[PDB]
Design a protein around this ligand. Structure first.
Ligand SMILES: *[C@@H]1O[C@H](CO)[C@@H](O[C@@H]2O[C@H](CO)[C@@H](O[C@@H]3O[C@H](CO[C@@H]4O[C@H](CO[C@@H]5O[C@H](CO)[C@@H](O)[C@H](O)[C@@H]5O)[C@@H](O)[C@H](O)[C@@H]4O)[C@@H](O)[C@H](O)[C@@H]3O)[C@H](O)[C@H]2NC(C)=O)[C@H](O)[C@H]1NC(C)=O
Ligand code: HEM
Ligand code: HEM
Ligand SMILES: *[C@@H]1O[C@H](CO)[C@@H](O[C@@H]2O[C@H](CO)[C@@H](O)[C@H](O)[C@H]2NC(C)=O)[C@H](O)[C@H]1NC(C)=O
Ligand SMILES: *[C@@H]1O[C@H](CO)[C@@H](O[C@@H]2O[C@H](CO)[C@@H](O)[C@H](O)[C@H]2NC(C)=O)[C@H](O)[C@H]1NC(C)=O
Ligand SMILES: *[C@@H]1O[C@H](CO)[C@@H](O[C@@H]2O[C@H](CO)[C@@H](O)[C@H](O)[C@H]2NC(C)=O)[C@H](O)[C@H]1NC(C)=O
Ligand SMILES: CS(=O)(=O)Nc1ccc([N+](=O)[O-])cc1Oc1ccccc1
Ligand SMILES: CS(=O)(=O)Nc1ccc([N+](=O)[O-])cc1Oc1ccccc1
Ligand SMILES: CCCCCCCCO[C@@H]1O[C@H](CO)[C@@H](O)[C@H](O)[C@H]1O
Ligand SMILES: CCCCCCCCO[C@@H]1O[C@H](CO)[C@@H](O)[C@H](O)[C@H]1O
Ligand SMILES: *[C@@H]1O[C@H](CO)[C@@H](O)[C@H](O)[C@H]1NC(C)=O
Ligand SMILES: *[C@@H]1O[C@H](CO)[C@@H](O)[C@H](O)[C@H]1NC(C)=O
Lengths: 553, 553
């Protein structure tokens, strides 16, 4: 008999469980609901969901009326909201983590094995009629045509929010510390066992390699002087597995924490910058703490750097993305109010959703020059050629591709998207609509409602058969976007909760850790609290270029 | 200049941080105290401190009167106070963990590398005048001498609280899933990565081993029939690493989660009991969910068994230890409205502290027979000679040693305590009196004040020279004990916090994992909710013998 759970009977986060031959039962525990399917709301829950504004109304608010916000921001109401965002958003995320590619149920192996990604919804069961559960055609839409007809850029669409490539690369850099899928273990598994902001893209994902990159004098990282400027050393000087092409000089290969960073100067730029930062922070620390050995200098530098990273991403990166008039604020003290887990596990869903390749331009402009993809990719000298200042000026001046709304991925990298989808299908990821519901939205009733348009819609309608067969990742990228926006509500509402839980769940945000001691006292603590994209750059260079996550005017 | 931190100048959980060449300061963040040393109370601390009664008094409060208590046990107050104890206890233990053998400060490697035991107090700094700080003599007392004069059991001192061997062997069994110190990596590193109640000692601490122990059918572990009884498999059938006397026939080796267990019949008794429970639990699962595969059946029964353990540990084990009239309760829902991190990292001090070898008797009486050590140790046929029922009955009946009070370790195992102190000095554990302060107790001012009696104090008084020299382990075992207690206040007052954090800082007890579905429904959940030592044994044996953590009336 057909598998009942395959209908996803359990609403509102109830857990569908098989009993006897073909019965099921939903466990409605702590859902706010009861009944066979968790649809009968408790007194407080009914109260809640009717007095609750729709996500878009809230967004509208946060993005309109400067006059109210000028006010709010300068008063404490700035913090009440920040607290609210933090706790409400994060709540959507199970911690301790629930499921993994192997387990569709809570298990110890699931909980203790950090090589796995987690997931918020269970897989689509194998014993099921259609690969998306119950709805749609037998064999799913072709991955390659889907990317061609819908994600392949025709002409270039700059982000209407003015996001620059400075941002784009920072995202790529930043994220490739917690997304590193295992080649050898395959889909659903991960190298990045820090599972968040450990900065393992600077100090590597392992101790042994970490050790290889370290000077072991003064808490510092190894480095090479070139044209008077500091850079990550060569693989000959610091011998770690780096994914450069073969034949390429280990004498040209640069050594950073993330094996793939040698492949784009974008990444190699930030690896440079963060390295200078780290060494720079060591210099400061050794002035106040001369009695300190080498080890306590490195480990402290790393905290500060972890601290700095979270401060910026929150107060600048997410700001840019949100466009909110409310100024966001990094302050773990907001979270000492309520029940919070300073623990994070990366979901496969988060992975899928962060494949932000659209941001990537038709070509890369460095003042007068116009380097193509082939010219840019795997370049072994561009970084050293221009230096940091010059390549910060350039990335900060170039508009990035809008993410949502479709047809805005450059053909050079469209194969990523293809794989993401194909990868999605191996992972038996649930339908997009099933994820709407789980991230507190209504499901879309049609393809029209999704795209806010007819042509793509009715075209997808027939490829996919039903809208409840629409997949996660395609769905995120094809949904309509309010003009003036970088992407669609589902990206915000699905991503934000994975995003914030990933930032604040870090243990340096705990009552235990968030003290000055942790950061070698007050200069250490103040460095975290006042850290900036400008500062991070212009403190570590001879001159100071346009630095920002947005283009100038 | 001498390192200022050597003085432990900083009170009530402040952090001594070395600054410049010869100075220091204290980070007294969130301590409740201000000032350079941190002895200047905030309004709230003072009130809280002039009105807090002593441990003596609370111990007295729970250990005396019964009328009041059997009343309290029938009201909501049981839950009220139970919660007080948990929160009170577990808030003294940092979470995220703080330091380890290598780092005397918070660091990422210390957050991240679970192969370390954590530590509540930092190590006595390597640049200090005396091995214990500043107070005391150049040489700590000879460890073997300290043992032989103070801990060697002359006459057997039975536990005044009636503790039996059945408890003793339970304590060992249970505690040996989270203390697996490296023979290889050395002092202060762990093989048992669960850092808690994960039943590694049953399923092995690694995936390789677990697979080898698993029958991979119905979710069961392998077993063999000897005399019609289910015992753990042979090593030929489950080829895993087990420590056995070389020369012992392979058919006579039993394979279990934990490598040492095969030595002592005690151990291999519980290993057998639990194994039987596991398979038994699968036999209830498969009936409920015949569609379920062996992996789920396996991982679900595991959670039921982890749950069953804590239930028994809290409601029966820790209850027996306490002598409290407060009926202790395992109810995770008690913490559901509170800052509580559902994690735990094992500490050296817990390991040290948990060395209750003074539990073990002179001989081991089994029915008409009385067994010497040279007869009990490593006996491989004994468990299978008498069978579970007959051996449980015999451990339940024989008294266990009194733990505190001094001179209660049998000579046969006296070398253990010798290594404990030795290791204590490799781990540079701070002096007893500092651990006193960390756990919200007043330090001792005289060796006289410590033991109570006049004689044995004054010998130490001359061995150590000064009370602030006295060592962690020794102080524990030599401290005067409350009116008829199994050990002194310090053990209680230091142990329990770790103890409790060790049970309830377990994801299973989290809001996320504490639902019927985690255990495959009501049936599983009710076994957790309703388990008893008596039931863990008798539901698995032909007849039901005497079983209990206390010797009879
Ligand atoms: C949790 O924590 C445990 C404790 O840290 C970890 O186990 C330890 O892992 C480290 C891995 O490095 C071990 O550290 C030791 O370090 C010494 C240091 O001496 C250095 O040797 C280097 C050798 O490099 C040599 O030269 C070239 C270039 O320099 C190298 O590329 C080449 O490989 C060559 O051999 C020197 O470069 C350096 O100058 C020093 O002389 C090293 O010699 C030891 O062999 C050892 O590696 C440590 O011993 C491990 N275990 C223990 C008990 O300490 C554990 O890994 C961690 N767990 C996790 C999951 O991360
Ligand atoms: C020209 C620039 C870029 C290149 C060359 C590139 C290339 C790649 C490649 C080859 C992969 C592996 C996919 C596969 O083999 O199937 C990948 C994965 C990924 N990319 Fe990009 N990408 C670029 C831009 C970006 C940017 C700007 C982001 C930031 C949002 C991003 C986010 C990701 C993520 C999250 C993954 C998954 C990582 C993993 O699981 O290992 N990419 N990228
Ligand atoms: C006759 C029975 C016992 C014997 C033969 C025994 C002997 C030993 C031995 C040989 C060790 C290992 C020390 C080393 O690593 O060199 C040890 C450690 C230990 N014992 Fe026992 N002991 C017994 C009973 C107990 C009891 C009743 C307890 C209370 C729970 C206990 C608790 C511990 C603990 C916590 C360790 C340290 C384990 C680790 O660090 O991995 N032991 N004992
Ligand atoms: C966590 O889970 C993975 C998946 O089970 C573990 O790896 C597999 O282990 C088995 C037995 O050791 C092998 O047959 C597989 O080939 C391994 N790899 C894969 C991709 O399945 C991994 O060992 C676990 N991690 C830890 C720390 O135990
Ligand atoms: C890597 O980038 C460098 C520049 O940083 C490329 O060389 C430059 O090419 C431009 C024209 O595209 C010239 O105006 C400059 O004279 C060149 N600079 C140097 C130092 O040669 C180089 O071609 C790129 N690498 C690859 C493989 O295309
Ligand atoms: C703060 O702690 C320090 C360190 O123990 C104390 O400073 C000592 O004070 C003595 C007199 O008691 C002086 O003679 C020494 O110079 C100090 N020693 C060190 C190592 O600094 C001080 O007493 C404490 N202050 C308070 C108010 O408790
Ligand atoms: C302030 S927040 O809710 O915590 N996050 C957030 C809010 C809005 C937007 N956005 O692009 O409008 C983007 C946001 O951040 C995201 C980051 C990654 C993925 C999704 C959202
Ligand atoms: C109820 S509790 O505070 O959580 N623990 C506890 C309390 C008292 C006693 N006791 O022997 O009176 C023993 C106790 O149990 C342990 C003491 C030390 C180590 C482990 C358990
Ligand atoms: C009970 C909650 C009251 C708020 C109604 C929520 C639905 C409104 O919906 C929102 O309206 C905004 C109006 O300015 C539009 O700009 C948004 O796009 C739209 O989603
Ligand atoms: C002007 C009001 C701003 C403060 C309210 C913070 C709400 C944070 O955003 C809320 O997060 C929830 C989790 O994704 C969503 O379900 C809500 O629709 C979303 O707006
Ligand atoms: C619950 O959902 C199942 C499957 O979605 C459906 O068949 C059933 O009718 C529903 N029951 C109730 C009471 O709403
Ligand atoms: C082991 O135990 C059995 C029965 O309990 C006993 O007869 C036998 O002699 C013992 N072996 C040793 C080596 O003491």
């Amino acid at each position: 008999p057909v598998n009942p759970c395959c209908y996803y009977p359990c609403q509102h986060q109830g857990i569908c469980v098989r009993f006897g031959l073909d019965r099921y039962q939903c466990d409605c525990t702590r859902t706010g609901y009861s009944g066979p399917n968790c649809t009968i709301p408790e007194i407080w829950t009914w109260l809640r969901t009717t007095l609750r504004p729709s996500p878009s109304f809230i967004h509208f608010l946060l993005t309109h009326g400067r006059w109210l916000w000028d006010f709010v921001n300068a008063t404490f109401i700035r913090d009440t909201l920040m607290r609210l965002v933090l706790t409400v958003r994060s709540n959507l995320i199970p911690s301790p983590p629930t499921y993994n590619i192997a387990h569709d149920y809570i298990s110890w192996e699931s909980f203790s094995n950090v090589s796995y990604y987690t997931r918020i919804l269970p897989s689509v069961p194998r014993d099921c009629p259609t690969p998306m559960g119950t709805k749609g055609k037998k064999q799913l839409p072709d991955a390659e045509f889907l990317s061609r007809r819908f994600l392949l850029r025709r002409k270039f669409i700059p982000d209407p929010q003015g996001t620059n490539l400075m941002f784009a690369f920072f995202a790529q850099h930043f994220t490739h510390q917690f997304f590193k899928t295992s080649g050898k273990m395959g889909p659903g598994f991960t190298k990045a066992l820090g599972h968040g902001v450990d900065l393992g893209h600077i100090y590597g994902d392992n101790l042994e390699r970490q050790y290889q990159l370290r000077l072991f004098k003064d808490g510092k990282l190894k480095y090479q002087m070139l044209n008077g400027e500091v850079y990550p050393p060569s693989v000959e000087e610091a011998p770690v597995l780096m994914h450069y092409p073969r034949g390429i000089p280990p004498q040209s290969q640069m050594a950073v924490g993330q094996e793939v960073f040698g492949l784009l100067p974008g990444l190699m730029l930030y690896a440079t910058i963060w390295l200078r930062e780290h060494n720079r922070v060591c210099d400061l620390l050794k002035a106040e703490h001369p009695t300190w050995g080498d080890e306590q200098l490195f480990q402290t530098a790393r905290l500060i750097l972890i601290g700095e990273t979270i401060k910026i991403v929150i107060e600048e990166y997410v700001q840019q993305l949100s466009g909110y008039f409310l100024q966001l604020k990094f302050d773990p003290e907001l979270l000492f109010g309520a029940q919070f887990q300073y623990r994070n596990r990366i979901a496969m869903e988060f992975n899928q959703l962060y494949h932000w390749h659209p941001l990537m331009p038709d070509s890369f402009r460095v003042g007068p020059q116009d380097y193509s993809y082939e010219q840019f990719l795997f370049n072994t000298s561009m970084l050293v050629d221009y230096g940091v200042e010059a390549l910060v000026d350039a990335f900060s001046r170039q508009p990035a591709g809008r993410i949502g709304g479709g047809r805005n991925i450059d053909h050079h990298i469209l194969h990523v998207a293809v794989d993401v989808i194909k990868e999605s299908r191996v992972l038996r990821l649930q339908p997009f609509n099933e994820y709407r519901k789980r991230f507190g939205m209504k499901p879309y009733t049609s393809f029209q409602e999704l795209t806010g348009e007819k042509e793509m819609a009715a075209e997808l309608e027939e490829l996919y058969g039903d809208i409840d067969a629409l997949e996660f990742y395609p769905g995120l990228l094809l949904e309509k976007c309010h003009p003036n926006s970088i992407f669609g509500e589902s990206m915000i509402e699905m991503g934000a909760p994975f995003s914030l839980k990933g930032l604040l769940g870090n243990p340096i945000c705990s009552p235990e850790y968030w003290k000055a001691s942790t950061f070698g006292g007050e200069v250490g603590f103040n460095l975290v609290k006042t850290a900036t994209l400008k500062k991070l750059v212009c403190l570590n260079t001879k001159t100071c270029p346009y630095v920002s996550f947005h283009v100038p005017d």
